[PDB]
Amino acid sequence: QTSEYYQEAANPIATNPALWAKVTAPQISWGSTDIRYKKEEPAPIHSAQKSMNLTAWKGEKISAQLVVWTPKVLNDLTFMVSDLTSGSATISKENIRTGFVRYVITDELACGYRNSADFDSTLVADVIDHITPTLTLPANSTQGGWISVNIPQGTKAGKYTGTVTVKADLSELKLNLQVKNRTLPPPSEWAFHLDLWQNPYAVSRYYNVEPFSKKHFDLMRPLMKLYADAGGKVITASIMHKPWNGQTYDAFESMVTWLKKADGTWYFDYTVFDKWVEFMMDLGVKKQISCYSMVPWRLSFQYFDQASNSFKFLDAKPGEVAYEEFWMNMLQDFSKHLKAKGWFDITHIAMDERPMKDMQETLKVIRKADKDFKVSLAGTYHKELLDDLNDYCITIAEKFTPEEIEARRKAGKVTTYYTCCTEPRPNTFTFSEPAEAEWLAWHSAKENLDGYLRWALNSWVKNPLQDSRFTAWAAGDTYMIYPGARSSIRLERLTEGIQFFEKVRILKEEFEEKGNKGAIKNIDKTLKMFDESSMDKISPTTAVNKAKKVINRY
Amino acid sequence: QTSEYYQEAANPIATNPALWAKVTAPQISWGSTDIRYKKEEPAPIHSAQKSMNLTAWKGEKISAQLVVWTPKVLNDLTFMVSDLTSATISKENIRTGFVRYVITDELNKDGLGACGYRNSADFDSTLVADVIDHITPTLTLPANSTQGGWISVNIPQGTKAGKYTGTVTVKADGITLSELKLNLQVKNRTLPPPSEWAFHLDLWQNPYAVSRYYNVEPFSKKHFDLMRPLMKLYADAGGKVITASIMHKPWNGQTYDAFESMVTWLKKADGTWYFDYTVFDKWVEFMMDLGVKKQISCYSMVPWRLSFQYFDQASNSFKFLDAKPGEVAYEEFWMNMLQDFSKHLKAKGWFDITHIAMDERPMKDMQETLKVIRKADKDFKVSLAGTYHKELLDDLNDYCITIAEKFTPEEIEARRKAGKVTTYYTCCTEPRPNTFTFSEPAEAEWLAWHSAKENLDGYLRWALNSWVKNPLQDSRFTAWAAGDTYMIYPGARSSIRLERLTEGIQFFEKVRILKEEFEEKGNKGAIKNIDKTLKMFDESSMDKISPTTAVNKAKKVINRY
Ligand SMILES: CC(=O)N[C@@H]1[C@@H](O)[C@@H](O)[C@@H](CO)O[C@H]1O
Numbered sequence A: 001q002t003s004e005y006y007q008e009a010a011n012p013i014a015t016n017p018a019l020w021a022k023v024t025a026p027q028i029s030w031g032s033t034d035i036r037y038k039k040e041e042p043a044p045i046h047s048a049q050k051s052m053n054l055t056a057w058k059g060e061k062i063s064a065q066l067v068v069w070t071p072k073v074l075n076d077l078t079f080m081v082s083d084l085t086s087g088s089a090t091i092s093k094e095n096i097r098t099g100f101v102r103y104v105i106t107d108e109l110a111c112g113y114r115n116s117a118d119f120d121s122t123l124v125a126d127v128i129d130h131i132t133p134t135l136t137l138p139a140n141s142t143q144g145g146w147i148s149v150n151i152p153q154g155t156k157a158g159k160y161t162g163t164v165t166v167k168a169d170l171s172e173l174k175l176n177l178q179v180k181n182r183t184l185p186p187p188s189e190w191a192f193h194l195d196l197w198q199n200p201y202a203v204s205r206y207y208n209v210e211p212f213s214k215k216h217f218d219l220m221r222p223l224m225k226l227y228a229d230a231g232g233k234v235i236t237a238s239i240m241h242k243p244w245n246g247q248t249y250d251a252f253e254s255m256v257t258w259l260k261k262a263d264g265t266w267y268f269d270y271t272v273f274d275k276w277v278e279f280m281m282d283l284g285v286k287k288q289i290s291c292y293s294m295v296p297w298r299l300s301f302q303y304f305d306q307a308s309n310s311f312k313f314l315d316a317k318p319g320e321v322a323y324e325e326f327w328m329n330m331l332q333d334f335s336k337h338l339k340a341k342g343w344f345d346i347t348h349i350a351m352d353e354r355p356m357k358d359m360q361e362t363l364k365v366i367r368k369a370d371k372d373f374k375v376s377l378a379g380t381y382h383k384e385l386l387d388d389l390n391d392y393c394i395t396i397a398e399k400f401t402p403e404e405i406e407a408r409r410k411a412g413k414v415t416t417y418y419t420c421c422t423e424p425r426p427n428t429f430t431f432s433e434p435a436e437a438e439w440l441a442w443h444s445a446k447e448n449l450d451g452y453l454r455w456a457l458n459s460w461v462k463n464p465l466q467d468s469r470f471t472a473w474a475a476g477d478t479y480m481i482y483p484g485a486r487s488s489i490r491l492e493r494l495t496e497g498i499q500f501f502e503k504v505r506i507l508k509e510e511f512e513e514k515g516n517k518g519a520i521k522n523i524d525k526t527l528k529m530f531d532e533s534s535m536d537k538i539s540p541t542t543a544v545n546k547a548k549k550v551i552n553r554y
Numbered sequence B: 001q002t003s004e005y006y007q008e009a010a011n012p013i014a015t016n017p018a019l020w021a022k023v024t025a026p027q028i029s030w031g032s033t034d035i036r037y038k039k040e041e042p043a044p045i046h047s048a049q050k051s052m053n054l055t056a057w058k059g060e061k062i063s064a065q066l067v068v069w070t071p072k073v074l075n076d077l078t079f080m081v082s083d084l085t086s087a088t089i090s091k092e093n094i095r096t097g098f099v100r101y102v103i104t105d106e107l108n109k110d111g112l113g114a115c116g117y118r119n120s121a122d123f124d125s126t127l128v129a130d131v132i133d134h135i136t137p138t139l140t141l142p143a144n145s146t147q148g149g150w151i152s153v154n155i156p157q158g159t160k161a162g163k164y165t166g167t168v169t170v171k172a173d174g175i176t177l178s179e180l181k182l183n184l185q186v187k188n189r190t191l192p193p194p195s196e197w198a199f200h201l202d203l204w205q206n207p208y209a210v211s212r213y214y215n216v217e218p219f220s221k222k223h224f225d226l227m228r229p230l231m232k233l234y235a236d237a238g239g240k241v242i243t244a245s246i247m248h249k250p251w252n253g254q255t256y257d258a259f260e261s262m263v264t265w266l267k268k269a270d271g272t273w274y275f276d277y278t279v280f281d282k283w284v285e286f287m288m289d290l291g292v293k294k295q296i297s298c299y300s301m302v303p304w305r306l307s308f309q310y311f312d313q314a315s316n317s318f319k320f321l322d323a324k325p326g327e328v329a330y331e332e333f334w335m336n337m338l339q340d341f342s343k344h345l346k347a348k349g350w351f352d353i354t355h356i357a358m359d360e361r362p363m364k365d366m367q368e369t370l371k372v373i374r375k376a377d378k379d380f381k382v383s384l385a386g387t388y389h390k391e392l393l394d395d396l397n398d399y400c401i402t403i404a405e406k407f408t409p410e411e412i413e414a415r416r417k418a419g420k421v422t423t424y425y426t427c428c429t430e431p432r433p434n435t436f437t438f439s440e441p442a443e444a445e446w447l448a449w450h451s452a453k454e455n456l457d458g459y460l461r462w463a464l465n466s467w468v469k470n471p472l473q474d475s476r477f478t479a480w481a482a483g484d485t486y487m488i489y490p491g492a493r494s495s496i497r498l499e500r501l502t503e504g505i506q507f508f509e510k511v512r513i514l515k516e517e518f519e520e521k522g523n524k525g526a527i528k529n530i531d532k533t534l535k536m537f538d539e540s541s542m543d544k545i546s547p548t549t550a551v552n553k554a555k556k557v558i559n560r561y
């Protein structure tokens, strides 16, 4: 973990020392989890808050942010948290995670290719750095601290008190936690269908290790554990070469060997695919495997040609007999392999969104190969595809009818929504407001959707700890977690949202059973705030904060 | 075969019409198989020879060359040969072709060799007669030009001995121009068919040149159908060795068409390897079905560049191991392939004939490579074309030496008794004897007589068909003297060079059969006479006795017995 230490990029905004003239000693205060504090300006806190009061269920993860700002050098700034105690009972401080909220270069408003102008760029607080044990802060700088309390499941309900000690070579901040009588199940038991596409090739490139070696998997374990502890349900698999035509910094390579032998037979080898899938299942991501893609963005299919001992490409489009023959041959081998492994029922062939013609022709092919193959799609609403798609994810702008949703729930199908570079808000860009990430989970509860999908968990740019920009899209679009298995503010807020989606579900189960129709109509009145057309009437921060309080009263 | 028709390149030497002023009508004559007749000059034949007398054994292939030269246009020149009669040799056994022209250059300016890179502009160029074109049925000759005709008589085995007579008819613009008379004395000895010859001929095959030239998929049905008559030329010359590339670019692409790997090298992401031999197997079976079945030579454990390609599953891409003989990494990489290869070859029944094949390198390298092979399987056969080393004489099952160096007679006999193969080669180093397109035809035959003189098992050359871009028109290349990279042509057309080499090989077989008969009969004199004749084929004696003279004298001596 010493090799995981790093330096931030230079701040493109210079520090005005006159703005710091009024700061006479180092300051410390509780801040808000809704705010990313600027590095180069004093915290906008005009008198310090020494106490923080939190409420949570047993089993819940709950966070707070403190801020330190200093007109002099602070050597070896450290945070530590006491045990929390309530009479003779204790939440042990092993369950409490601290991190420095570190800075990354971002830009602004979001689709299409970009030239970064470094004139348009700024440092923003986003990285939860729980690895570096101390930081030295330069004079005239501000530094956030993130505190995560993982409340154990067997914790006694009641009032817990504890201390956050900040040192540099001070103050104590007070932490109060009301633990309620209700229990939140562990992440492995959450209903919420979270899908954040994984990029293992980004990790092998960043650390310069052999793909799918022991070192590669050792590096991925804590990183993918971040996804599984957020309720991650879906394994991403690239079953061919460059499903997305190298749109990310690191292209996805094939996890399947496509070897066309010189006698006309094919040898398909799934060694990589199998290792990746088994690895992710051992971490608790086991609900679904999504296989990309039969319809890549460029319709050119790589295979290893033995006769010439080289890579070749079939150029073939859905609706062609050649496309049908090429995919039938692989999909029928793949079907047998999956059935041998016991993964067939959960494996989905996964599309991205194309002219209607294309998608139906691709579907014919899949069905000829095996009638029971499951299929998924993230794209636009089409009535034509509602009975064929076992997992259907729709743009936030479009809606399924309530009858469509129940028909799909009745049939055992998954129904979700996504955002990407199209939507200014809500989103998980590095300059997005933190509460927008939590908002996304509340929106799923409002819509009776099964969850939320985003296209990039960890498709890291070149220097993801320093600069979140990319040659396409708004900064942060390509990843939500960082090298070192470091979380972001964005993923932490999303996880709080998902925990509340589970609370709502548990509360409605209890209220329906007891005939408490009033409590149900109130939860639904509160859920009305999470409409994507109503964000100028009620800000995402305000909606999220009001809704949290309502659910916690029950 | 209509798609196999072609046009020659322009002659870079213009025609001197004063040199033709003496030629008043078309001339037709028997010529010599020792001469490549120049296109732009009259045949150097001071008066026409109408009769050709040949002698041969039953089973022997024997050739003659006629020449036509003309001061006027000859439209649709054609040759045809009658049955030969006494009993009959049917004319189905007789092949005719036009001796067509290819651009050639010359030795290195110093005249001492022909190796090293070259620009064509720094060297002469000239058209030379070399292609035996048996496919094109007629040619139109321009005024003031000369054209050779090659005639091959394949004497069937059951042919009755005695005097055979027949006619070669040459026609143009409809009419007959001349009949030439062909006489053939068939002797009461029998030469076995090529499949039964002892002579160890190794001419390295390049299947990738054929797939490129015809633009077909490698190791497809079309590719093999094209290669069948072409590789049959090699088998009918006594070819014994199948060339296999068991890794990517054994010679680092030194020829126009690089050799690809006939073996899939797949490093799986779980630490195991998968090797697949589907190409290798198809190529080997194909070549064995044509009668090339004695030996398979696998190139190479020691390429110049020392960079070994493999398919890396984890990254789904090609990678290269840089590892040198004498390194543990080289040893681990090759051991793993060679042990899998060993099992495969045993499953197929090919292990006893398969040789791992080196080219020449520092002594250190070769012995370290040998340790690796032996660790993999102690019974792996090994071969080498290079320099003489006493150190390697028990380890090399097939040892081919430069013509300049010698094994002792004891070394040869020890190697023969152990069942090993011992040969020599030439390449770009030797000005003569050689098979450059400008080399004298008899030099190709000479090579086989030299093997008989040295008690060697045969002869090796590095390129049967490593065709340049336009091999029918221009035999030059970016390296070496013209013709160094191939001996046969598109259309399964033979060269003068391969036809003469084949005659030499037939005589090597005759010598062997005659010595078997003379030892058994105690006729020690006839044996001492054959050896006195074989003394002419020394590579230091070519300024005392020209290769042509030596070959012609020797042929006569053997044919008297
Ligand atoms: C379901 C989804 O997110 N699809 C694409 C995604 O592949 C990526 O290109 C993204 C860039 O932000 O644009 C989205 O249209």
Ligand SMILES: CC(=O)N[C@@H]1[C@@H](O)[C@@H](O)[C@@H](CO)O[C@H]1O
Residues within 6 Å of the ligand: B251, B254, B359, B385, B386, B425, B426, B427, B428, B429, B461, B462, B480, B484
């Ligand atoms: C064994 C042998 O023939 N080796 C090389 C051959 O690879 C080729 O480069 C040739 C060119 O004429 O030169 C030979 O020395």
Ligand SMILES: [Cl-]
Residues within 6 Å of the ligand: B249, B250, B251, B252, B253, B254, B255, B257, B258, B259
């Ligand atoms: Cl090569």
